Amino acid sequence: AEVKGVCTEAGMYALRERRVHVTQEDFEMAVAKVMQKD
Amino acid sequence: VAKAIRDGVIEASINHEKGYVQSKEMIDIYSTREPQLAFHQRISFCLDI
Amino acid sequence: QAAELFLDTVSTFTSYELMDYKTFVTYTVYVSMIALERPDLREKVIKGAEILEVLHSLPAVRQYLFSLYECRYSVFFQSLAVVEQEMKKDWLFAPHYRYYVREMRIHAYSQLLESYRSLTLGYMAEAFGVGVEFIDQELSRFIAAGRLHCKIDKVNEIVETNRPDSKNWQYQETIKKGDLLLNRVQKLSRVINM
Amino acid sequence: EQKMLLNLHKKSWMEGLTLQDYSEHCKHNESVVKEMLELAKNYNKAVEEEDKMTPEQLAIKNVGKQDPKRHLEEHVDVLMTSNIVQCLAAMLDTVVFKLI
Amino acid sequence: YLMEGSYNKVFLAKGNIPAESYTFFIDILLDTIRDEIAGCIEKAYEKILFTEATRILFFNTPKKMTDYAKKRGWVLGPNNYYSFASQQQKPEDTTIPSTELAKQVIEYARQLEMIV
Amino acid sequence: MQSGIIHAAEEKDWKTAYSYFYEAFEGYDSIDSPKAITSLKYMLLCKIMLNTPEDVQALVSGKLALRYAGRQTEALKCVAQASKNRSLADFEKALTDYRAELRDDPIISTHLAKLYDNLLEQNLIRVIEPFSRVQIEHISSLIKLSKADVERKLSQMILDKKFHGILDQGEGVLIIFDEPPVDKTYEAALETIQNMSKVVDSLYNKAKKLT
Amino acid sequence: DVLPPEADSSIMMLTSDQKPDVMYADIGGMDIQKQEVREAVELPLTHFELYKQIGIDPPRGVLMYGPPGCGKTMLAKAVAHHTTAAFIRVVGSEFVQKYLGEGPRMVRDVFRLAKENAPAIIFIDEIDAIATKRFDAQTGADREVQRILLELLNQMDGFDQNVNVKVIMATNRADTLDPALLRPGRLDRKIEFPLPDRRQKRLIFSTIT
Amino acid sequence: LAVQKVVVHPLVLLSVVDHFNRIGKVGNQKRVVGVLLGSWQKKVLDVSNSFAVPFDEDDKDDSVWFLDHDYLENMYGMFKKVNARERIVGWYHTGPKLHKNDIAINELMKRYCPNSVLVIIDVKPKDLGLPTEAYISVEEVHDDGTPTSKTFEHVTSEIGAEEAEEVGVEHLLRDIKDTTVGTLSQRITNQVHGLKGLNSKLLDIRSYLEKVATGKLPINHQIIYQLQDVFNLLPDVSLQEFVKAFYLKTNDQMVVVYLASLIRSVVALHNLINNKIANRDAEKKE
Amino acid sequence: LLKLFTTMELMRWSTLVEDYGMELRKGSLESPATDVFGSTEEGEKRWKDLKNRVVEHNIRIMAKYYTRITMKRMAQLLDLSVDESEAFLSNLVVNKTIFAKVDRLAGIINFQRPKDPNNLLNDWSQKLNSLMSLVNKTTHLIAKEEMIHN
Amino acid sequence: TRPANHRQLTFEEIAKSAKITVNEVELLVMKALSVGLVKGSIDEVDKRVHMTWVQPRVLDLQQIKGMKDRLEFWCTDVKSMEMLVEHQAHDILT
Numbered sequence A: 001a002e003v004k005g006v007c008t009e010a011g012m013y014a015l016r017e018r019r020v021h022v023t024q025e026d027f028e029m030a031v032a033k034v035m036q037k038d
Numbered sequence B: 001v002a003k004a005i006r007d008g009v010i011e012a013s014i015n016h017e018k019g020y021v022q023s024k025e026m027i028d029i030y031s032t033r034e035p036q037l038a039f040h041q042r043i044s045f046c047l048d049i
Numbered sequence C: 001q002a003a004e005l006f007l008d009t010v011s012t013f014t015s016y017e018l019m020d021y022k023t024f025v026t027y028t029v030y031v032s033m034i035a036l037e038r039p040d041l042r043e044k045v046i047k048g049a050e051i052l053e054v055l056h057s058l059p060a061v062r063q064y065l066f067s068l069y070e071c072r073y074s075v076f077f078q079s080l081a082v083v084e085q086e087m088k089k090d091w092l093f094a095p096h097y098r099y100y101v102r103e104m105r106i107h108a109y110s111q112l113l114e115s116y117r118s119l120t121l122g123y124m125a126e127a128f129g130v131g132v133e134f135i136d137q138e139l140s141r142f143i144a145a146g147r148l149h150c151k152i153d154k155v156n157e158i159v160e161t162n163r164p165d166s167k168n169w170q171y172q173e174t175i176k177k178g179d180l181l182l183n184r185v186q187k188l189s190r191v192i193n194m
Numbered sequence D: 001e002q003k004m005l006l007n008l009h010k011k012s013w014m015e016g017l018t019l020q021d022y023s024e025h026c027k028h029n030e031s032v033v034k035e036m037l038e039l040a041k042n043y044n045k046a047v048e049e050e051d052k053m054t055p056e057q058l059a060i061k062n063v064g065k066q067d068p069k070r071h072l073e074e075h076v077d078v079l080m081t082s083n084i085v086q087c088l089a090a091m092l093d094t095v096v097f098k099l100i
Numbered sequence E: 001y002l003m004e005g006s007y008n009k010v011f012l013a014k015g016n017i018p019a020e021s022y023t024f025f026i027d028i029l030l031d032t033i034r035d036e037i038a039g040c041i042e043k044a045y046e047k048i049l050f051t052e053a054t055r056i057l058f059f060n061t062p063k064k065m066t067d068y069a070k071k072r073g074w075v076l077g078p079n080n081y082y083s084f085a086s087q088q089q090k091p092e093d094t095t096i097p098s099t100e101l102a103k104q105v106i107e108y109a110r111q112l113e114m115i116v
Numbered sequence F: 001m002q003s004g005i006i007h008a009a010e011e012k013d014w015k016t017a018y019s020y021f022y023e024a025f026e027g028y029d030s031i032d033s034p035k036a037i038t039s040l041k042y043m044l045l046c047k048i049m050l051n052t053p054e055d056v057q058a059l060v061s062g063k064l065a066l067r068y069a070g071r072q073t074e075a076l077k078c079v080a081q082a083s084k085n086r087s088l089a090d091f092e093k094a095l096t097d098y099r100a101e102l103r104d105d106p107i108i109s110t111h112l113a114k115l116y117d118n119l120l121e122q123n124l125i126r127v128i129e130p131f132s133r134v135q136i137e138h139i140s141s142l143i144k145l146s147k148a149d150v151e152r153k154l155s156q157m158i159l160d161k162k163f164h165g166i167l168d169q170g171e172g173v174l175i176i177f178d179e180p181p182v183d184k185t186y187e188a189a190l191e192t193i194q195n196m197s198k199v200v201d202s203l204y205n206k207a208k209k210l211t
Numbered sequence G: 001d002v003l004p005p006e007a008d009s010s011i012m013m014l015t016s017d018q019k020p021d022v023m024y025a026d027i028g029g030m031d032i033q034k035q036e037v038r039e040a041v042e043l044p045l046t047h048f049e050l051y052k053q054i055g056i057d058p059p060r061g062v063l064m065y066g067p068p069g070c071g072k073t074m075l076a077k078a079v080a081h082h083t084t085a086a087f088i089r090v091v092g093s094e095f096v097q098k099y100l101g102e103g104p105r106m107v108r109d110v111f112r113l114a115k116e117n118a119p120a121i122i123f124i125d126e127i128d129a130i131a132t133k134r135f136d137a138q139t140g141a142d143r144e145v146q147r148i149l150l151e152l153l154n155q156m157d158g159f160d161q162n163v164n165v166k167v168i169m170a171t172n173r174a175d176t177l178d179p180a181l182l183r184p185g186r187l188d189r190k191i192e193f194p195l196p197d198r199r200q201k202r203l204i205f206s207t208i209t
Numbered sequence H: 001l002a003v004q005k006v007v008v009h010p011l012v013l014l015s016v017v018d019h020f021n022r023i024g025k026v027g028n029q030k031r032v033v034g035v036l037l038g039s040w041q042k043k044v045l046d047v048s049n050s051f052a053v054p055f056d057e058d059d060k061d062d063s064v065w066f067l068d069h070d071y072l073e074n075m076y077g078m079f080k081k082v083n084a085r086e087r088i089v090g091w092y093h094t095g096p097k098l099h100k101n102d103i104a105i106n107e108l109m110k111r112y113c114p115n116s117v118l119v120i121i122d123v124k125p126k127d128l129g130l131p132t133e134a135y136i137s138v139e140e141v142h143d144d145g146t147p148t149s150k151t152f153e154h155v156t157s158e159i160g161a162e163e164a165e166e167v168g169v170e171h172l173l174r175d176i177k178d179t180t181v182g183t184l185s186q187r188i189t190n191q192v193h194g195l196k197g198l199n200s201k202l203l204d205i206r207s208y209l210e211k212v213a214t215g216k217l218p219i220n221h222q223i224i225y226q227l228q229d230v231f232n233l234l235p236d237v238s239l240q241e242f243v244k245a246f247y248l249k250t251n252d253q254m255v256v257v258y259l260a261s262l263i264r265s266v267v268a269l270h271n272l273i274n275n276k277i278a279n280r281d282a283e284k285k286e
Numbered sequence I: 001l002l003k004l005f006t007t008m009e010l011m012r013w014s015t016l017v018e019d020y021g022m023e024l025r026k027g028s029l030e031s032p033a034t035d036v037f038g039s040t041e042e043g044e045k046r047w048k049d050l051k052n053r054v055v056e057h058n059i060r061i062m063a064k065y066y067t068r069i070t071m072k073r074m075a076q077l078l079d080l081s082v083d084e085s086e087a088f089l090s091n092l093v094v095n096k097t098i099f100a101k102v103d104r105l106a107g108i109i110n111f112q113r114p115k116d117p118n119n120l121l122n123d124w125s126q127k128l129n130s131l132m133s134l135v136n137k138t139t140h141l142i143a144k145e146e147m148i149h150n
Numbered sequence J: 001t002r003p004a005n006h007r008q009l010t011f012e013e014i015a016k017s018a019k020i021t022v023n024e025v026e027l028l029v030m031k032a033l034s035v036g037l038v039k040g041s042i043d044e045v046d047k048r049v050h051m052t053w054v055q056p057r058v059l060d061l062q063q064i065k066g067m068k069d070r071l072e073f074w075c076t077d078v079k080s081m082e083m084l085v086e087h088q089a090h091d092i093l094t
């Protein structure tokens, strides 16, 4: 579930930049938010 | 070429002294009755079906 | 449609079972030059970060793409000849290799004539690295087909461009495609009755 | 008394020869033809769907869901009445109100 | 040759006839060709020079033009040119065929309402 | 602040670069940092490269941005005036009056060349706007550029469909055309025919299979 | 006869004069909460295609919970003030009515009116009034509230991805909520509004002072 | 002016006809005059009821005429009690045309309604026009210097009905009215009626000009002024710009008809397919 | 002077200075001059702006009545040089104040916009509507004359 | 005086008939157009005024006869198509 939440957060990060394609940066920034912050 | 511009095959004119054929500038097809005529035979055929 | 679909997946390509990524970008560039307008080509292909990266390792395809955009018509014809042989040996582009090259030649002639009111035959021959007789025959074939908006004054060897309205071109397609549709409707009623 | 009541909703003779605004007539033609563009796309789906539909669903499944065929006919009827009248009235006016 | 407009070969057909019996019908044809050639010129040439049309009309003596000119009503110009300004009689797009168009549009309405 | 700089150095969309400079500005503003003027500079520059220079006046007029009203904001505000007026001459005067605030900043100086090309198109449109047929030499006089440079740009603009016209090399004139918008009724009619053809295809399968 | 969908609705939308005067700037120090509500309510309302292109499934509803006085209702006021979409404001206690069936009825009028006026935001403050996890089948109150909640679950289940309606529910007693309300597809985004931290405190102090 | 349009309801027409048929009985066949009742909505009058008043005039002298104005007040109060929202809006008379003495009668009616509207309601069933001609009194200020005089200015009149009024009218016209004709046929019939109405009005102007030409009627110089404007407004349909635009427009509408006819044929074939499938299926089971 | 800016006609700047210049700038002892057009820097700037208003008014009048005019004629009518008039006209065209297409080769300024087929037929339709209303109004006028003279 | 087909007056005709210099013709038409005496537009490039309307004036009996003669032609044209639409659309006429 935490792994799945990282993906859904990675898609959010692309949207924050108004991008269409999820980049590797988004997955890494999603990993930090899901695990370390929460 | 002389008959072709008489029969309406092409719209042009011949300069006998110079020796060339000058084609007439094309007229706006959509600004005359031809689109209506083409549509009429298509409309009446659809209404027939 | 191929250009639209390829450009969407140029940054999401994982279908390696069909083709290599370099070959995929090669096809993407090819279909883009024939199906995209000049403003659409510069945003998606010329300035495409993913395409430009691949074009570094594909000097021939990059030369073919940028020769037309940068109005280098002599090189573009040389590149178009190279592209033509590739597509003849390619099972996907083989049935359309004659059509694609002809349309690309139409694009180059139209692009050169688009910005000018009249261009001499010699200048157009000089631009494409070809003879005056070649440009005269190619234009006369394309103008007769209705694909070039120009007319040749052969006595003075001057090509004068026209600006026909979009209403005429739309009307011919409506007559054309409507007649194609009507033929199906007529044929279907024939099947219905008996 | 019957002929007198027949005058109800009888439009004036001006309205018969009155031409609808051409800017709005083209706009109405523009909009409705665009409406049939989506309806024709939906109409194709209805043909395949009704091929594989049980006869109990010929009407129940059409309840609450828009019928592309029905709206296509209404759009066709409206446009052909609108354009024929606009064309016919325009053609009549070119000779009736003639300066020569 | 007559259909494609090879009027040069039509007059050359006199020389290479297959047999002496064919002469009569050839002259009968050549009288028709003479009007047909000049018929093109009015719609083809906007002005053609006097002796320029001699070989076009296949006239031997210049005098044979003079009688044919008035028969065809060709207004000769001072510069030995015939002015053929007659294309002004265009298909007359100046006029809208309102009655014909109103006739057609009514028929569409008939094919929509009269059916019942 | 670095996120916007890298976003702008890569010539990506400037909306994201503006946003990063906007949040960098607020954080620098909250702590009362000397670098808040640099972020306020790059925010306006992002608006300039977004072809919305009018918003630059509104930004500096805000309460948070009034504290930084100085020469650096003046540099971009006049560059915005230049883009808003579609004046290339004003741009050079802007680059002269505030050369230090504009030509010496490493971030803005990189995008100055792109601004020059962007303003060259807009000024050309403004110069040729009142004309239907104008000498190329007259256009060069108004723009204060060479005949060859303006003719090359005009030919390239015609290819880019930025304005509708043709170039007469022999007379050296630009013929501008008032094109009509495409008839969307015919566009919708054509695709309706295409979609109606698919219905005929579907009715064909129904016709042959069921009879 | 068939009545217009916007007709027959005892609950009305927010008019322009009923829009609260509370701004986003009036709220101090809720950037995490402001961002999540924006990303889950107002951004999908205007960027539904960008969600679909990326692949994110927008949350149909948002549950705002936390200790009382932590900005739950006010953010709804700010959202209603700063929205271009319709706002339907309600509190769960109004759904419980004397006339049996009027509760579940007026639940579906809220969702029908929101669907007809899409884009729209449904805000249901004090959701605990109709979303308590305990039900007594021998009492008319719990029998009716069970119908109200079941209709509420049915209505949110009845919204596909095409219908652009977002639901906001606020409660300070989310422990008493029925778990069925928090299932995916009904309230997929639970935003917590905790007690302000020290950094949050100085932003709240600065904005009021 | 003060009146933009007068909507006369079918009850008034029936009442006015009944007034004429009961006064114009074996007694005589003159014009009958009553009092119009209705409401005001923005600038469109809503004539909805009327009552008859005793009235007589001399066939020879136009200044001799009687209207029972006390009868007017008594029945108005009688009608006001039933329907207070219906006030006096003018008078009517069944005369086929105006009379010289109407301007005097309107002055008598102007006391009960300052913006009184006279509606001439022709009992005879005229073929092409509406039976109602609504007039209002105006002060025509001549520029020749002739003193300002009271005249009637025409107000466009329409026959409209109330919801229950139209229910009864459709009941009385149930058999006579033919509603089977489609909209397109009705619109073309409107165009034929428009042509007939224009020809009649053009004939009236020509008849007036004939009388002026032979000296039967004096030269007006306000009609002639208007007539030059009519002939000046006559468009030139032989212009190149107009003809091209007409062709441009006609072809724009034709393609839409062609598209709609094309869709109609496809839908018609779909109906034929379903009919043949239904026919074949019915005989298979039987 | 205020009327001169109301009449739908050309006014000449040279005439204004020779007819209103002294009364507006220097004024008279009987009627003192206001500070709108004084000798100051503000007065001089407003004096230049007044000339623009006169020039702008003339172009507005030239757009109503002329369909095509020559730059040579427009410069003469504006009391401006050809370059100044073209630059002044080019300014108004840019800010969408007045429509004008300038053909600099032939020295022609075109004040008529392209005729949309909608507009051409709408004008034709509007003429018919006025015509039918006039025919209606004439018939009513005829009926009154039949009443009076019978 | 001129028919509506030929209401395009040159500057020379206005200059000659009004005894004014050709350069003063333009200002003359402005006064006529501004007051409202006539309606139209001026084509300065072609030295021509396109006249579309004149203030209606007093007509003699003879000109009124001519005006009626135009009505007779106009009446026939309206009646001609009234019978044309009736005959052609007889089946669908209500």
Ligand SMILES: Nc1ncnc2c1ncn2[C@@H]1O[C@H](COP(=O)(O)OP(=O)(O)OP(=O)(O)O)[C@@H](O)[C@H]1O
Pocket: G026, G027, G028, G029, G030, G066, G067, G068, G069, G070, G071, G072, G073, G074, G075, G170, G171, G172, G193, G204, G207, G208
């Ligand atoms: N971040 C904030 N900035 C400013 N005021 C705040 C903030 N958070 C809460 N408030 C104050 O909260 C008050 C109202 O509380 P609000 O209704 O927003 O809370 P709630 O969580 O919905 O409450 P409850 O759970 O009791 O229903 C306002 O008067 C407002 O001043």
Ligand SMILES: [Mg+2]
Pocket: G072, G073, G074, G125
């Ligand atoms: Mg609260």
